[PDB]
Amino acid sequence: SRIEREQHHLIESIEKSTQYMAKRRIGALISVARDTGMDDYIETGIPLNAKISSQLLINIFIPNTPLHDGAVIIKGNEIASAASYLPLSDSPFLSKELGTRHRAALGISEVTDSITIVVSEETGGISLTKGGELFRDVSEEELHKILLKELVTVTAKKPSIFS
Ligand SMILES: [Cl-]
């Protein structure tokens, strides 16, 4: 448990799972809690309290399965819940071409500092919401830089479990 290792593993787990789902046009909605709490939305889903892995993220979103219909919420170093409610944005600025997953990702971003990642089941495009804004159809490089900037808070320092 060396925080920096955990944060980089989280980034890699999001990258690998979203890449897998994007190629197959599997819809996905993954919200990562930061300083603002997501606890009430965690309570709306199915509790997992699971180790983060790309494999589990993929298995969650397989269509027509018990865990797929809603958001995954990641809290600290766990996949806290699946099939969670997120508030829908009412914004008329969000394109009508985008679906409920994007509107849900935009809505949680308007009321928390969470970072939310969407895979479109229509296009396979990957999008990201933060602070009421949408980053639509980001490339792999762009997704990587954003996740690095927003989910990694520690620089090169001495590894220690007590960090
Ligand atoms: Cl979608």
UniProtKB/Swiss-Prot annotation:
Q: What coarse category fits the chief subcellular location reported for this protein?
A: membrane
A single GO molecular function term of this UniProt record: ATP binding
Localisation per UniProt entry: Cell membrane
Recite the UniProt keywords alphabetically.
ATP-binding, Cell membrane, Membrane, Nucleotide-binding, Nucleotidyltransferase, Transferase, Transmembrane, Transmembrane helix
As for membrane topology, the entry says:
Multi-pass membrane protein
Cofactor(s) it depends on: Co(2+)
Cofactor binding: number and manner? Optimal activity at 0.5-1 mM CoCl(2), also functions with Mn(2+), for a construct missing residues 1-80.
What's its catalytic activity? 2 ATP = 3',3'-c-di-AMP + 2 diphosphate
| Top-level enzyme category | transferase
- GO terms of biological process kind: cAMP biosynthetic process
Q: EC no.?
A: 2.7.7.85
- Using the record's annotation, list all stretches that form the DAC domain: 1-140
User: What is the documented disruption phenotype for this protein?
Assistant: Essential, it cannot be deleted.
The residues the record assigns to binding ATP are 69, 86, 99-102, 120-122
What is known to happen upon mutating residue 70 to A?
Answer: No c-di-AMP formation (construct without residues 1-80)
An annotated GO cellular component of this protein is: plasma membrane
Instruction: Relate the protein's function as given in its record.
Output: Catalyzes the condensation of 2 ATP molecules into cyclic di-AMP (c-di-AMP). c-di-AMP is a signaling compound secreted into the host's cytosol where it triggers the cytosolic surveillance pathway (CSP), a host pathway of innate immunity characterized by expression of beta interferon (IFN-beta) and coregulated genes. Expression of truncated proteins (missing first 80 or 100 residues) in E.coli leads to c-di-AMP synthesis.
Family classification: Belongs to the adenylate cyclase family. DacA/CdaA subfamily.
User: Subunit structure, briefly?
Assistant: Homodimer, required for active site formation.
Q: What name goes with this protein?
A: Diadenylate cyclase
Organism source for this protein? Listeria monocytogenes serovar 1/2a (strain ATCC BAA-679 / EGD-e)
